[PDB]
Amino acid sequence: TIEILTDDADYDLQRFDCGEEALNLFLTTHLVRQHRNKILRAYILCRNTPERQVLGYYTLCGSCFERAALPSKSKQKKIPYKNIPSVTLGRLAIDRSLQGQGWDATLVAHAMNVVWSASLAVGIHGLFVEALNEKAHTFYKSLGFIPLVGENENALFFPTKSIELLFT
Amino acid sequence: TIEILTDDADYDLQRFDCGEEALNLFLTTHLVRQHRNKILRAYILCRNTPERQVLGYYTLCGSCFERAALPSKSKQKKIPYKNIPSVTLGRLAIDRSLQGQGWDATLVAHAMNVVWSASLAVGIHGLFVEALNEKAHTFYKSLGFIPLVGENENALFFPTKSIELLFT
RNA sequence: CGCGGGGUGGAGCAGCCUGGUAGCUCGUCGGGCUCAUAACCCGAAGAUCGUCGGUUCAAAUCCGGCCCCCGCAAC
RNA sequence: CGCGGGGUGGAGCAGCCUGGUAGCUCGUCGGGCUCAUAACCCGAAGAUCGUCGGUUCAAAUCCGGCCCCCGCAAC
Helix, strand or coil: CEEECCCCCCCCCCCCCECCHHHHHHHHHHHHHHHHCCCCEEEEEECCCCCCCEEEEEEEEEEEEEHHHCCCHHHHCCCCCCEEEEEEEEEEEEEHHHCCCCHHHHHHHHHHHHHHHHHHHHCCCEEEEECCCHHHHHHHHHCCCEECCCCCCCEEEEEHHHHHHHCC | CEEECCCCCCCCCCCCCECCHHHHHHHHHHHHHHHHCCCCEEEEEECCCCCCCEEEEEEEEEEEEEHHHCCCHHHHCCCCCCEEEEEEEEEEEEEHHHCCCCHHHHHHHHHHHHHHHHHHHHCCCEEEEECCCHHHHHHHHHCCCEECCCCCCCEEEEEHHHHHHHCC
């Protein structure tokens, strides 16, 4: 099952290793208080085992971006404010032992489900992500992430309405 | 009871009248698609009557602000990003017939409860509000809203931890 | 769904209304005729009709979802 | 809770460790003495110990939550 971090963590963190080093450091170093200080929410894809074998995680932090980053002025005439409510997908990683099996997209989908249940609360438009990787940018575009073109040139977006349609 | 807008609205909107005109226009004019386009979420304080007597409402839109707006550099050393996850309390109003009875604060508290349940999802820090009214700024400071001093000089803030402590 | 219009060679228009059919003016190029040409005559290429779906033996055409562009009232 | 220090007249320090007590140097001002003064002698004011709580007959002092400030490693 997929689950958020409990109050008592009791996770095994060192034997985990995703692809990129920077994300390993983000896991080992910055995540603890950022979760406890309610900077972001971390969701964990684990085996539900006693060892809590760590194989995936993702981070969600609400955010804003310049409205001009939208590609279509038609969508701009729909939003009456200079800033756009967004949720930044801060980081997303799966252990290397499972890469090439689509669990990346499964995590993105669970995150979209959570963002949908959240849209019931503060009604933001979808998922913002600033993908440094080129593979990540193309991988997101494969799932249909809208490229945001503005002062930022590396972000991809996913609308709330597409999330509604995905869950029928 | 307090409730969000259903799919079928069936509300009585004209006989409602809050204090400020601008908010009346925001209600009559911009709210419909902003709810339907998932720009924000509107919560309604109604009598649960057949007429759906409208006496209060508030709007929530996730947002960001410059980190330098925080008053204490101590809290700045806690947040490792230039932008801070926030939820903007876009608008808040109660019908004039009930002003001076504290339902303003009751709505703020229900909104805080919702932001708490949301903090379980994207872990933002609390409530951002840009209060044009001076009465509103002082009224928020009475409930303990932290004034944000930065490029913006009119916003007030409420942390997530205070919300946790309020609900015991 | 704020009101309304619109989607097609490279550009700009008609083809609908009325299901079966790719048309017109520029532009490109080829050819013919001229001392010669952006001028005159002839010819060729490029759009599969914004995308997706439905009905139909068949769809640019009728119907629905969505996308995009333009003007205006509001921000 | 990244590591560590710190909170007190207007500024900078000690008072803890050891519960009962407001102290020192500047600064302000008043007075005395000088041709006179920031110089010498005397005196006064201003902090209720960051905030909140707990224990105690009693708290700056012990204990807890929180707030704020400084340095450094990281961003």
